[PDB]
Design a protein around this ligand. Sequence first.
Ligand code: HEM
Ligand SMILES: [Ca+2]
Ligand SMILES: [Ca+2]
Ligand SMILES: [Mn+2]
Ligand SMILES: [Mn+2]
Length: 367
Amino acid sequence: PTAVCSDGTRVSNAVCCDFVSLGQDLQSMVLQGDCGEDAHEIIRLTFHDAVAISRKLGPSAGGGADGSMLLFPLVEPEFAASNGIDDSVNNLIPFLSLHPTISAGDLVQFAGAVALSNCPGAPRVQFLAGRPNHTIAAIDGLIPEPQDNVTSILERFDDAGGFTPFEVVSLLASHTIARADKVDPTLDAAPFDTTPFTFDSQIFLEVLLKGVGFPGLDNNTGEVSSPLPLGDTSTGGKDTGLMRLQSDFALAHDPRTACFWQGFVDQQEFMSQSFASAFAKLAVLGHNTDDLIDCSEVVPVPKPAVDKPTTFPATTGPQDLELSCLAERFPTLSVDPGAQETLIPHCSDGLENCTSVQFSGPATDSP
Ligand code: HEM
Ligand SMILES: [Ca+2]
Ligand SMILES: [Ca+2]
Ligand SMILES: [Mn+2]
Ligand SMILES: [Mn+2]
């Protein structure tokens, strides 16, 4: 039956109420209301946790969205494909004992939903609760890597949960709030779009620009040339230049995915809704939803989409596009004024000096 939570939220099931205090603690202790580093890493973790499941190999290969990354932190986080996931894992582990009624699987997905809510333009995602509190570690080899080709990526997502090419591209809207710490051993927080604290369609536009250089080294696995490689890190600054992943480039130009990729350019609501639908499917891999309860009402209302239109970043323009989609014309968009590349801020407040919460814990990472 219905009930009302301590914060006034109307819920269809009183067991949803335990998530209210969890959300509050996730914000006060880790996320700090920001679409920042810790939020981004936690959203990345929802994917690393959930995608480790295989129809063809059967249940023993992995239980999907099951908290396996938190419950066996000495196994999957140290597989090569998850290098760097230790930060999010170690940040979430303490919540298992602080909120002992909430399973690890539920914790991972709820933390991702709360993190998304901090990002202007992000959808208010579905949240179903009730994932069991026990599992085993997944096998290695189930997480796509940025050097993988589109056939491989599409097969992996299809085998994980029957995701279509459209749903894959939709999920990759997440790269609108993403940066890389491990791809280039000389760079920290190399952003994938010019607005890494805004859940917008800049990623879709910017991957379609011609690459002209690299923000760091020119030969990292899984990395390709960037259209906006300039940063201030050569003089000690923290505003790393923009990085492009091979996989994002490949998705943007493959015949199976290129029209879906371009279709999100300057289509904020379509992008956010499409991401939401695919992400809800991702969040329940390893579960029959009949065995879960709807606690969507305790996901915070997200920060609204920004007013700013989708635009070409300074020094770029439509003449720089490499287009592959015949089915839809690329829209006419304004160009941001400026003669030199605009530094991409390291922090959501526009500065370089922000710091992030990091708890110590059992998961580790490699140089
Ligand atoms: C083909 C599939 C994917 C590939 C190859 C891929 C690859 C990557 C890589 C290489 C990084 C940088 C990690 C680092 O070096 O620090 C990254 C970051 C990230 N990924 Fe993706 N990813 C994929 C799909 C997804 C999905 C489905 C989601 C979530 C729905 C996601 C969310 C994120 C987020 C939020 C970050 C940023 C973390 C941060 O900024 O701290 N990724 N991904
Ligand atoms: Ca898992
Ligand atoms: Ca963005
Ligand atoms: Mn790290
Ligand atoms: Mn990171």
